[PDB]
Amino acid sequence: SHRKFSAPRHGSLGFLPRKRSSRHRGKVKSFPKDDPSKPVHLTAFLGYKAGMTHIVREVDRPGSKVNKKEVVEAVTIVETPPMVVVGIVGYVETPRGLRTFKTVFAEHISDECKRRFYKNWHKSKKKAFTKYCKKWQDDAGKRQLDKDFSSMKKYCQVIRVLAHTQMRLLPLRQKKAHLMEIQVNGGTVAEKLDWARERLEQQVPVSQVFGQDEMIDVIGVTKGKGYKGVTSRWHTKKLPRKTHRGLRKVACIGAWHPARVAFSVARAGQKGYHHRTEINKKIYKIGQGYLIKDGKLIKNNASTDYDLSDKSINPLGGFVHYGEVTNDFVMLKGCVVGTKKRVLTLRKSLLVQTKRRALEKIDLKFIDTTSKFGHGRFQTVEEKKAFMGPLKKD
RNA sequence: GGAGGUGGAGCACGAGCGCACGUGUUAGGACCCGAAAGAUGGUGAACUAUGCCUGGGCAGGGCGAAGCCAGAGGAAACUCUGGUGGAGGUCCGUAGCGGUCCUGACGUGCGAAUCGGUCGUCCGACCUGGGUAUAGGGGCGAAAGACUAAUCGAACCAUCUAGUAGCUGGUUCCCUCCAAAGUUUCCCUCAGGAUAGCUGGCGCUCUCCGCAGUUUUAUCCGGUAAAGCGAAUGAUUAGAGG
RNA sequence: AGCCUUGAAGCCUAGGGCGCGGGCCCGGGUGGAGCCGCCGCAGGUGCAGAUCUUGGUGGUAGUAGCAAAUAUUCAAACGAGAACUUUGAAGGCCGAAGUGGAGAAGGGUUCCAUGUGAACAGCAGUUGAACAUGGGUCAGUCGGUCCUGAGAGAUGGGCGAG
RNA sequence: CCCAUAUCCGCAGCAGGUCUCCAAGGUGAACAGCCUCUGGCAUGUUGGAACAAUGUAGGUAAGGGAAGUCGGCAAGCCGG
RNA sequence: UUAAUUAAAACAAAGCAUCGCGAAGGCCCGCGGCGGGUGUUGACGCGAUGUGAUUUCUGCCCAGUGCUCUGAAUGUCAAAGUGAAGAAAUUCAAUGAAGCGCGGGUAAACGGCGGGAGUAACUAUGACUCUCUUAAGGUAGCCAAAUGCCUCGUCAUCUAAUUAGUGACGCGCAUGAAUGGAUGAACGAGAUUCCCACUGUCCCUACCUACUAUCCAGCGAAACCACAGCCAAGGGAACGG
RNA sequence: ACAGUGCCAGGUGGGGAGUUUGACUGGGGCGGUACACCUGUCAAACGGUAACGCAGGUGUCCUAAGGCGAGCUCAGGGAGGACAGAAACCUCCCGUGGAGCAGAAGGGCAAAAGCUCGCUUGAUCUUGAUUUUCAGUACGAAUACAGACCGUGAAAGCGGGGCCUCACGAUCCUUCUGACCUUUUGGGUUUUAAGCAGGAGGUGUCAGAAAAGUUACCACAGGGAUAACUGGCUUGUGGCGGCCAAGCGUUCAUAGCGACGUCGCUUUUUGAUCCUUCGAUGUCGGCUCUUCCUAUCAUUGUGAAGCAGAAUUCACCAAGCGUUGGAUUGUUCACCCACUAAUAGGGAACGUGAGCUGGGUUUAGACCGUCGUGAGACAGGUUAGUUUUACCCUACUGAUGAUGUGUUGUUGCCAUGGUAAUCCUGCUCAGUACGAGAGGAACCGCAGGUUCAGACAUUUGGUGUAUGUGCUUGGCUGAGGAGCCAAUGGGGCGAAGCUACCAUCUGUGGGAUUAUGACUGAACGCCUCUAAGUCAGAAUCCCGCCCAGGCGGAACGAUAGCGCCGGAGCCUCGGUUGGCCUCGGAUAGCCGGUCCCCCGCCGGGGUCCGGUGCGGAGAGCCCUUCGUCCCGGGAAACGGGGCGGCCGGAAAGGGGGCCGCCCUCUCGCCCGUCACGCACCGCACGUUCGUGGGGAACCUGGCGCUAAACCAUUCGUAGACGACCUGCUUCUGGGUCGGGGUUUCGUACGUAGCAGAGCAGCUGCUGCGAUCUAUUGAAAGUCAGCCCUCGACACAAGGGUUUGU
Ligand SMILES: [Mg+2]
Ligand SMILES: [Mg+2]
Ligand SMILES: [Mg+2]
Ligand SMILES: [Mg+2]
Ligand SMILES: [Mg+2]
Ligand SMILES: [Mg+2]
Ligand SMILES: [Mg+2]
Ligand SMILES: [Mg+2]
Ligand SMILES: [Mg+2]
Ligand SMILES: [Mg+2]
Ligand SMILES: [Mg+2]
Ligand SMILES: [Mg+2]
Ligand SMILES: [Mg+2]
Ligand SMILES: [Mg+2]
Ligand SMILES: [Mg+2]
Numbered sequence A: 001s002h003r004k005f006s007a008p009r010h011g012s013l014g015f016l017p018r019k020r021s022s023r024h025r026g027k028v029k030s031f032p033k034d035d036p037s038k039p040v041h042l043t044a045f046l047g048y049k050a051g052m053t054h055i056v057r058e059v060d061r062p063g064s065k066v067n068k069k070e071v072v073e074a075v076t077i078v079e080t081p082p083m084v085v086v087g088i089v090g091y092v093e094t095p096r097g098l099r100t101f102k103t104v105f106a107e108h109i110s111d112e113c114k115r116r117f118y119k120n121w122h123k124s125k126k127k128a129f130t131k132y133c134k135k136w137q138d139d140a141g142k143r144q145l146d147k148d149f150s151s152m153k154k155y156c157q158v159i160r161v162l163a164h165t166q167m168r169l170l171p172l173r174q175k176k177a178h179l180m181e182i183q184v185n186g187g188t189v190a191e192k193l194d195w196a197r198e199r200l201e202q203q204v205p206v207s208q209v210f211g212q213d214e215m216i217d218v219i220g221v222t223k224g225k226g227y228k229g230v231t232s233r234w235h236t237k238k239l240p241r242k243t244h245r246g247l248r249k250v251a252c253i254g255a256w257h258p259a260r261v262a263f264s265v266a267r268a269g270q271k272g273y274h275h276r277t278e279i280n281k282k283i284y285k286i287g288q289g290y291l292i293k294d295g296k297l298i299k300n301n302a303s304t305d306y307d308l309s310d311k312s313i314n315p316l317g318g319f320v321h322y323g324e325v326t327n328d329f330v331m332l333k334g335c336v337v338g339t340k341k342r343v344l345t346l347r348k349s350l351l352v353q354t355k356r357r358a359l360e361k362i363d364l365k366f367i368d369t370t371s372k373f374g375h376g377r378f379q380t381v382e383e384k385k386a387f388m389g390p391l392k393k394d
Numbered sequence B: 001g002g003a004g005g006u007g008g009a010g011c012a013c014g015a016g017c018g019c020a021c022g023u024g025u026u027a028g029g030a031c032c033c034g035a036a037a038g039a040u041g042g043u044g045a046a047c048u049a050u051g052c053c054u055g056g057g058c059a060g061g062g063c064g065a066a067g068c069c070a071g072a073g074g075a076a077a078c079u080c081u082g083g084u085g086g087a088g089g090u091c092c093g094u095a096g097c098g099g100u101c102c103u104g105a106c107g108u109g110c111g112a113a114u115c116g117g118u119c120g121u122c123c124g125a126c127c128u129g130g131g132u133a134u135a136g137g138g139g140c141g142a143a144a145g146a147c148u149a150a151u152c153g154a155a156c157c158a159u160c161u162a163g164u165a166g167c168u169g170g171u172u173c174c175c176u177c178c179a180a181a182g183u184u185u186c187c188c189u190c191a192g193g194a195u196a197g198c199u200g201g202c203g204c205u206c207u208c209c210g211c212a213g214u215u216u217u218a219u220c221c222g223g224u225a226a227a228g229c230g231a232a233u234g235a236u237u238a239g240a241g242g
Numbered sequence C: 001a002g003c004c005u006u007g008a009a010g011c012c013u014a015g016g017g018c019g020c021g022g023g024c025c026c027g028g029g030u031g032g033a034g035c036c037g038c039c040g041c042a043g044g045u046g047c048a049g050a051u052c053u054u055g056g057u058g059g060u061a062g063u064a065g066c067a068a069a070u071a072u073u074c075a076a077a078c079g080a081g082a083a084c085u086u087u088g089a090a091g092g093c094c095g096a097a098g099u100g101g102a103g104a105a106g107g108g109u110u111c112c113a114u115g116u117g118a119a120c121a122g123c124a125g126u127u128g129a130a131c132a133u134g135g136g137u138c139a140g141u142c143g144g145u146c147c148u149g150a151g152a153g154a155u156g157g158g159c160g161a162g
Numbered sequence D: 001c002c003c004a005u006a007u008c009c010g011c012a013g014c015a016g017g018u019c020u021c022c023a024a025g026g027u028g029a030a031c032a033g034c035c036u037c038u039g040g041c042a043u044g045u046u047g048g049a050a051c052a053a054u055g056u057a058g059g060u061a062a063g064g065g066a067a068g069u070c071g072g073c074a075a076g077c078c079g080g
Numbered sequence E: 001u002u003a004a005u006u007a008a009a010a011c012a013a014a015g016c017a018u019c020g021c022g023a024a025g026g027c028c029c030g031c032g033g034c035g036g037g038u039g040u041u042g043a044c045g046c047g048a049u050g051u052g053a054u055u056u057c058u059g060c061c062c063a064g065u066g067c068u069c070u071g072a073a074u075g076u077c078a079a080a081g082u083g084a085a086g087a088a089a090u091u092c093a094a095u096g097a098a099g100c101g102c103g104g105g106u107a108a109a110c111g112g113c114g115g116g117a118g119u120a121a122c123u124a125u126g127a128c129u130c131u132c133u134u135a136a137g138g139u140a141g142c143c144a145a146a147u148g149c150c151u152c153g154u155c156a157u158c159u160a161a162u163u164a165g166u167g168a169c170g171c172g173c174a175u176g177a178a179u180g181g182a183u184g185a186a187c188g189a190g191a192u193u194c195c196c197a198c199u200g201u202c203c204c205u206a207c208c209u210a211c212u213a214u215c216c217a218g219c220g221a222a223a224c225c226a227c228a229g230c231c232a233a234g235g236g237a238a239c240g241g
Numbered sequence F: 001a002c003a004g005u006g007c008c009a010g011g012u013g014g015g016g017a018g019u020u021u022g023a024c025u026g027g028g029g030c031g032g033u034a035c036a037c038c039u040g041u042c043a044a045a046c047g048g049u050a051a052c053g054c055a056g057g058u059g060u061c062c063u064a065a066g067g068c069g070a071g072c073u074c075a076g077g078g079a080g081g082a083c084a085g086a087a088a089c090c091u092c093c094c095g096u097g098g099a100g101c102a103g104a105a106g107g108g109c110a111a112a113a114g115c116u117c118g119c120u121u122g123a124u125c126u127u128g129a130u131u132u133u134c135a136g137u138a139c140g141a142a143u144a145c146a147g148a149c150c151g152u153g154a155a156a157g158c159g160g161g162g163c164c165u166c167a168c169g170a171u172c173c174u175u176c177u178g179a180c181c182u183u184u185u186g187g188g189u190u191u192u193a194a195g196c197a198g199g200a201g202g203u204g205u206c207a208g209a210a211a212a213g214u215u216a217c218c219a220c221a222g223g224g225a226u227a228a229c230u231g232g233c234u235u236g237u238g239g240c241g242g243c244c245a246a247g248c249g250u251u252c253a254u255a256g257c258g259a260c261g262u263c264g265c266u267u268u269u270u271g272a273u274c275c276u277u278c279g280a281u282g283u284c285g286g287c288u289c290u291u292c293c294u295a296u297c298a299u300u301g302u303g304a305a306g307c308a309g310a311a312u313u314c315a316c317c318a319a320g321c322g323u324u325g326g327a328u329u330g331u332u333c334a335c336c337c338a339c340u341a342a343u344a345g346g347g348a349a350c351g352u353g354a355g356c357u358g359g360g361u362u363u364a365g366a367c368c369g370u371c372g373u374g375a376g377a378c379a380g381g382u383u384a385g386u387u388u389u390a391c392c393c394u395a396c397u398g399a400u401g402a403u404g405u406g407u408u409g410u411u412g413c414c415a416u417g418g419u420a421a422u423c424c425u426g427c428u429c430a431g432u433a434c435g436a437g438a439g440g441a442a443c444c445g446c447a448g449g450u451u452c453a454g455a456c457a458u459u460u461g462g463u464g465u466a467u468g469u470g471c472u473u474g475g476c477u478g479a480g481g482a483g484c485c486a487a488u489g490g491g492g493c494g495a496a497g498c499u500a501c502c503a504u505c506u507g508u509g510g511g512a513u514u515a516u517g518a519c520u521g522a523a524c525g526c527c528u529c530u531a532a533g534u535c536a537g538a539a540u541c542c543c544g545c546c547c548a549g550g551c552g553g554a555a556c557g558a559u560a561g562c563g564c565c566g567g568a569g570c571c572u573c574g575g576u577u578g579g580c581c582u583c584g585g586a587u588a589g590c591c592g593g594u595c596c597c598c599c600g601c602c603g604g605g606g607u608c609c610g611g612u613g614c615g616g617a618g619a620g621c622c623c624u625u626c627g628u629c630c631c632g633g634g635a636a637a638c639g640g641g642g643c644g645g646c647c648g649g650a651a652a653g654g655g656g657g658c659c660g661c662c663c664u665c666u667c668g669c670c671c672g673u674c675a676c677g678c679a680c681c682g683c684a685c686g687u688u689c690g691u692g693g694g695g696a697a698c699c700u701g702g703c704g705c706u707a708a709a710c711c712a713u714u715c716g717u718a719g720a721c722g723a724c725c726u727g728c729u730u731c732u733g734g735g736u737c738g739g740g741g742u743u744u745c746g747u748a749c750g751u752a753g754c755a756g757a758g759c760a761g762c763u764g765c766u767g768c769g770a771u772c773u774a775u776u777g778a779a780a781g782u783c784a785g786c787c788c789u790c791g792a793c794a795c796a797a798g799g800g801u802u803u804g805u
């Protein structure tokens, strides 16, 4: 018989199966559709979730209750040291879909990238690309590369660059770089290859990919949470306290007929560590990394037009469980998937951004840099010392 | 003794007895296993029920009965106030005894009734050891058909006894031939029998005229289909002429 | 005038065959002492079942489980072997209505010494209330013994087939 | 000799049952509970490593305060 | 108090009221007797019942069924005895124990305790009247009560809203007087309603601890099993592995 | 002389014993009797034929209503006759039975079978046969006779009951009647008793026991032959929907409704039935959770109104998304309160008890009412009443993994499967359109929210055994200090982590189209959204975005006794027995040339000419194999065979053609001349693709390569275990300790104090004293999963198992 009172089902069947992701680094499932009339540009990037904070800005929203007024907004800090292009991969459109046509690699590949090619770097002899790299040094090999580059011009329709991160500049334990294809959108196929060929072994800073006030998508793997029951995995109603044999369950997992449990019924199992794509996360700031100019370390990348204090984005005591952000970073509005240190794929939007929220221009008045390791109450150590005064340590 | 009818499991020139084999029906344990029951004679009150005999046991508190002392009041009766006193099938509560709820634990348990918290009572119609008495259509019951050795709306043990079962289950090698019925009547008959029918087997009396789930030719029988209702019975519409 | 220690019955056999079949024959192996053909006689004479009887074995399955009562750690000794035995030292618990010291009923040698580590003690054990070989309970005065208790129970007598 | 979370009865070294005697300090009304001395024991028929779900047993919870449920069941408040 | 699903409103109880009995007796046991229990007793006792403290009250009915009392006045009435017929067996008559019939008593014995119509100067009711009628025709009380079908009765109160609760009403299917009626302090691990307080019961879930589960070494069962084990429809012993 | 006892006799005697307490039956019970009979019908023209089928009857009645004879004629009607009339009695006429014959009905009957008289007892005695039911038994009833006695009639005759079809009863026992009856046991007489034959006493459950209840304290043997669920057939009832059109709607049938009638659909109602299940399918409701239907309440896109606007009603495509919080009740159902866009209706074994709960129903205790003598009963109330098992298979959820790609790794494609966003409010439009007024919109834009989904912890909150740091109770270590125990002693605050619409962030684009509105346009000289053709078109659908990623591919790196190129054989697996190396397409039209003309980066259009049952044909084309020899003739000579280079190929990429070479042949093809070869004596598996695929090996030359994976260790971005993410010598690495930062609590011990309420002792001093001030934002902790050090210390160049085209 029909269920007495209507109610929406718990959870979305569009995110099934609720299993551990097969990839740790978020995969770009769909790159932006190429527009041949735009200049050659890259469409994605890799960053690492440093941590969260909040900022003060004045909203510019005509007809809104917060028009001309200051608001406090949470933001996620993603460290984005420049990537290094090391290879090109070309694709051919076939009636069975894009097929990898040809891959070319640069002559020199840093050991961070090579670590990606091994399961035990300690035990290996580091022989990767030791014989390929010779193709760039002899006339017979060189004449074979430009033919490979010429073939990719005749036949390939999609061009991507194999860029990798620079793990030596991060505060992390890992030394193995994250390597990913990035589609080269823009001009003709020939213009894509000349642009990509010129940038082999070169560095591509995040600013060259993304801009201020741009809406982007973050792709990553959520925080794993292990085996979970239906109450926590699916958010079903807890049964009454009197229930015998447990109340953190779904009471009826199906009807007599069909004589099977259906795929649409909440069950226990893995929670978290799911691949997810989130869209429309606005870029609030592309902060510049530390520079040594005239013997001085310039690090006031957390200063604003309305706050001239020389402080970095790092909070007192550093980003908890992450470290210190000393490279370029992207300040995203809101929260993103993953743990601290999680590698996050930054991708340009697949949509046309014509909305007041999407077009709004961000102007920061303040960036909170108090300690997150507790209830921090000082923005800077200079401010803390001036308030507290001398201590017994002094 | 005769004549003529009628009842008999008769005579009318024997066919029986003895033995053996088969089949069928029965009486017996009765093809095998299966009741709930009933009867006789015995063993149990080490559990529990109840009476009796002789022993043991039950913190700390609350309330504050009668009696008594003092002070005040009063003409008397007596009254008021403060103490003392320590009653009670009295109250909170431990040991003990019990077992309300969680409808908790457990539910192939630690346990064939237990465990946790929470609970009832806790000087009495109180709790308990041992001795002793009541024994099965009997006991004992502050009464629930309770208890009477994990057994109780009649214990347990052996025998009668292989109790009876129109009811359930089973019923053991091969080939060959033939091959049903669920219908009639009677039955406290309706899940069963007896009875006729349907089957099989053994033959025997003949044969190389008789018979037939058939037609033909003759000849009867019938009251359904249809038809009729300006024909009987019954029902029924409309005008018309007297 | 059957077969048989020059190998009976039984049992096994990707051996050769026979018969529509019930079955049977022969070859090979194992076995070690009896057995079969034909004419008759006799029967406690043929199994797939009966929640059949008795015995054996599976999958489940190296699975459920070995979770009630706060708790162990260090060093050494013996030893083939040590989370579990002994000693020493720590840290804990029962907390005088005890996890202390003694009895009644019941048990019946479980008591004590030495030995074993087969089986048992639902892991292990160098240990045990297990197994083995030997010991151990001393009374005028502590109980029984005697008294009578509720009660049981002869004789006389009565009843009674007994 | 045991006299009982192992010498007895429950098939067993069974969280059950089974009659008694003696009875320290502190707190406290107290043979209550909590800690300790005398005496006793080795966590109750095993250990190691983890710290998922679901349990069993304990706790805490903003704002509301029975709207839950057959029912305030459960817990909670009160407490000398 | 139902050991082991019911702890209760059930049982008991003091109180109350009946009933039998003066011992060669009442009540009871026993196969049996100069047998036995009450009874080491004696009506302020023993035996058999009902109700269930106190308070207040306990109405009418003896026709029915019981129980009980009186009996030669006296219908029926066994054996035995008496008389007559007959050869006797036998038959017939007369007589007439208890018990039944007959007549009283008795309900704190089992139990029971009506129907129809008309009627007051608006309407409604109908104190009043008529009538049929039984052994009485339900009195004092009480009630949609643990008792009322219709029924979630009607009115009021309690809520925003109440098949719940409480107070009223009462032609009450089918209330009612020791088959006890009405009450009422204290008491209840008894049933029910509301309120304050409290709170994770809930909105709406989260986190933490211990023991498991978990993995490992050792050790290690049991239930159950035709063969088994992916579905849709079909047909089919009318829902197929 | 009674109590008393022994033995008989009568009464009483559920205290106790034994036993019974029918059958049929759309379950049983209650109700009926279809249980023994009879008539009509069913019944299908012999007979027979069932149902709790239909319409009825029977357990009697008759001294005549039996028997005979005779004589008459009935119901009804018409017409006449004093009282007399509708109806009394008399008369005449008609009268086929329309009357009567005991009764139910059917049949039969007119000088009779009816009515009336006269005489009577054939309703008597007796043996057989027969018919009906049937078994060819009994009874009952009936039919023909036969033998006696009779009645009646003049007689023929008729009659042994009723005009025919019903009206009834075994054995045993009792009673009566009959005989010059038999027996009555050793004989005789006599009473008695028993026999034989015929009646009666009765069994209606009628082929014939002698028979009351209750069980909820219940029991056994069974039954799915049989009820209480689901399911199945059916669909009366319930629900929903059409058709006709009398009316309603002021007018007007059909905007919206719709009588009298009628046709359907559904199985979310109840029935009917009894097919499955009684060696058990857990029986109401709620809770929880998913899914599906549409008969659509809301929302999107629409059509019609008795649509001015607003509001509403009818209808279409339509199930994408929603459809709520509560008081009373066990409730389903209902009723109300409140909010809402709306508060639609249903299925899934009346979804869902090894998912729960157990309020109700439905055991055992107990109360009330009614009923019963009672035990007891009650779709009447009330209260208390044990909810068992998963470790098996599958399904499902997650986790390792498996084939096979030579091994291994990085980066990737996507076949397939899933899939998602949703509704409302405010502002503006606008007090505008519309409207007399009242009232009163909409599209575009802007700002928010609801429901849902996916995350996340900067902030606020929650937790907190960091057992971090204070406070604090009882006890314990002689005290101080420092601590511990009280199953987390209690409590304040609290890091990290986890976590809350209880904080924060984010949630998207196309295509074909449905309904509908249209274009052009015939059919059908007009018209027409339709017939051919064409356009716009949506919470629908499909795709995208997003989640997974195949016994599915790809590119690229590195490849340890192994890779590449260049002899005999041996095993094993099979199949096969020439090749076609390509326009695009139309089919009411095609193909090939022609370029002479027009365009274009040699190709397109035109013209012109040829073919078209395609012959520049798949009905086709190419290749064709017996070999060699001698010498001729045609054909080649621009020729055949054999090492270096350049154009060219990517959807799954060419051992094609062409330029050189140094060579090598004038033989290859056709027709002839000339002979030869194992000619194996008629015969199968012959004849290739075939140096086929795969596997071991054995060689024998050249050119080349010297890896990873897994374990172990470590990490914590991960986690039940596996798995997953990481590190393991660049004078560099991680580790440990130390230091610094951050952060929590809140100011340490000691020491000093002329601070301290007081008290004690000594003559102002010294003691005891909770607490107070300074030292002292002090002390203590702080990554175990916080940040930075490069200070100290050691360690680190390792170990095991595998893998080859
Ligand atoms: Mg619904
Ligand atoms: Mg429960
Ligand atoms: Mg923080
Ligand atoms: Mg016979
Ligand atoms: Mg026999
Ligand atoms: Mg009997
Ligand atoms: Mg005793
Ligand atoms: Mg008391
Ligand atoms: Mg008390
Ligand atoms: Mg329980
Ligand atoms: Mg369990
Ligand atoms: Mg007593
Ligand atoms: Mg007795
Ligand atoms: Mg009873
Ligand atoms: Mg037998």
Ligand SMILES: [Mg+2]
Pocket: none
């Ligand atoms: Mg037997």
Ligand SMILES: [Mg+2]
Pocket: B166, B191, B192
């Ligand atoms: Mg039978």
Ligand SMILES: [Mg+2]
Pocket: B188
């Ligand atoms: Mg009979």
Ligand SMILES: [Mg+2]
Pocket: none
């Ligand atoms: Mg049968």
Ligand SMILES: [Mg+2]
Pocket: none
């Ligand atoms: Mg006929």
Ligand SMILES: [Mg+2]
Pocket: none
């Ligand atoms: Mg006809």
Ligand SMILES: [Mg+2]
Pocket: none
């Ligand atoms: Mg074999």
Ligand SMILES: [Mg+2]
Pocket: none
């Ligand atoms: Mg021998």
Ligand SMILES: [Mg+2]
Pocket: C044
């Ligand atoms: Mg024998």
Ligand SMILES: [Mg+2]
Pocket: none
């Ligand atoms: Mg067998």
Ligand SMILES: [Mg+2]
Pocket: none
């Ligand atoms: Mg295990």
Ligand SMILES: [Mg+2]
Pocket: none
């Ligand atoms: Mg244990």
Ligand SMILES: [Mg+2]
Pocket: none
């Ligand atoms: Mg002791």
Ligand SMILES: [Mg+2]
Pocket: none
């Ligand atoms: Mg001792």
Ligand SMILES: [Mg+2]
Pocket: none
């Ligand atoms: Mg062991």
Ligand SMILES: [Mg+2]
Pocket: none
């Ligand atoms: Mg010993």
